[PDB]
Amino acid sequence: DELIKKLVTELAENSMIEAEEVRGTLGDISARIEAGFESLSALQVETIQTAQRCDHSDSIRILGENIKILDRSMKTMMETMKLMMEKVDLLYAST
Amino acid sequence: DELIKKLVTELAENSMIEAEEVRGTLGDISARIEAGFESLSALQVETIQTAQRCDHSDSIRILGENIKILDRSMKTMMETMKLMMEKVDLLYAST
Amino acid sequence: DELIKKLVTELAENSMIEAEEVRGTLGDISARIEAGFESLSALQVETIQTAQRCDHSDSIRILGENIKILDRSMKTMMETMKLMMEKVDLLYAST
Amino acid sequence: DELIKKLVTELAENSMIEAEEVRGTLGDISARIEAGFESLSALQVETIQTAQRCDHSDSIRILGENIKILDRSMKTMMETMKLMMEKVDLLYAST
């Protein structure tokens, strides 16, 4: 195995160059994977944080509650109007 | 083919190591693909679930409906005011 | 080049198997890329379509416009009240 | 090393073809990575821009403020009604 091992090395010497170029190419691809995923997920988090600003559950409830306060104040006023009119009716009949 | 097959094995013995290292590298890349896609999609689902909380179609409709109830109560009161005034006008002329 | 070409084939015969297994592995990776991107983008479109349901620009404007109608009706009523009172003042002084 | 180098070239000649086909396949994969990431991120930006249209913080505040103006106008009217009634009471007792 004297001449055999000399040919084993001279063949590895030429393949090792093509193995290095594939390894670098694979690492270039791996770097583009971890860069796309790191970028999109940061943009994705920015989407969730933005969406949260549009949840107006409490704001709309407070508007709703204050419309019902006004409705109750309108009932209170309708009772005060009929009360005033029932005094006016008495004033007319007192002539 | 006695010596031929001895050189075929001694060459496979040295290439098999470089094939294993490429296979492991490919599997490292494949694992990063299924990890990025599993993570981003989970973050993406969290975005849809968050966006749904901002659909206030029904809340805003109930506010709108109760503003129109108040508007109708305001028409009812305007008729009651003119009614009261038309009794006051009669009371003035009765002097 | 008689014996040379016989060794060229017996070496290609053993490498061709390792080339096929890498080609299949590469295609397995390529298929996972086009599957993740096809899935996430479909989920992403579902996010945009969901977000559109939360744009209540017109609904909120119609609420705003009808609150200002009520405000104008309240001004109309305040003028009718002072009008009624200015008739009541005259009725008191007519005694 | 006369015959040795002739076999080194005739072996590189057959491997160089399989190296080119792997290089093209790797580049086909790399192109699908930069295409998916470029597409999804453009769709992701469209999601953020859409979500911003649903932030009605200011619109809802102006509705809230104008409901409280109406509430204050309703208090002003309740004072004017009791004022009118306190003149009507005096008119009844003046008989």
Numbering used by the authors:
A (entry chain A), B (entry chain A), C (entry chain A), D (entry chain A): 1 to 95
Would you copy out the relevant sentences from the publication that reported this structure?
BoDV-1 POD crystals (fine plates growing in urchins) were obtained in PEG 8000, only in the presence of calcium chloride. Crystals belonged to space group P4212, with cell parameters a = b = 35 Å and c = 166 Å. The analysis of the asymmetric unit indicated that it could only contain a single-amino acid chain (Matthew coefficient of 2.1 Å3·Da−1 with a solvent content of 42% for a 108 amino acid-long chain), meaning that it was likely to contain a single narrow elongated molecule. This informed our choice to use a single coiled-coil chain of the measles virus tetrameric POD as a starting model to solve the structure by molecular replacement. The monomeric POD is composed of two consecutive aligned α-helices (from residue E73 to Q123 and S128 to A164, respectively) linked by a short stretch of three residues, making a ≈ 140 Å long molecule. A tetrameric POD could then be reconstituted by applying the inherent 4-fold symmetry of this tetragonal space group. It was then composed of two α-helical coiled-coils with all the monomers being parallel, with a break centred at position 126 in the middle of the whole structure. Considering the electrostatic surface of the domain, the break seemed to separate the N-terminal acidic region from the C-terminal more neutral region. In addition, the Ramachandran plot showed that residue D126 fell into the β-area, whereas neighbouring residues (C125 and H127) were in intermediate positions, between the α- and the β-areas. As opposed to the trimers, the tetrameric motif of POD identified herein did not form regular β-sheet main chain hydrogen bonds, and the shift in the helical axis was limited to 45° instead of the 120° observed in trimers.
It self-associates in oligomers through a central oligomerisation domain (POD) and bridges the RdRp and the nucleocapsid. Here, we used X-ray diffusion and diffraction experiments to provide a complete structural analysis of BoDV-1 P. We observed that P possesses a modular architecture, consisting of a central oligomerisation domain (POD) surrounded by two disordered regions, similar to other Mononegavirales Ps. Using X-ray diffusion and diffraction experiments, we revealed that BoDV-1 P adopts a long coiled-coil α-helical structure split into two parts by an original β-strand twist motif, which is highly conserved across the members of whole Orthobornavirus genus and may regulate viral replication.
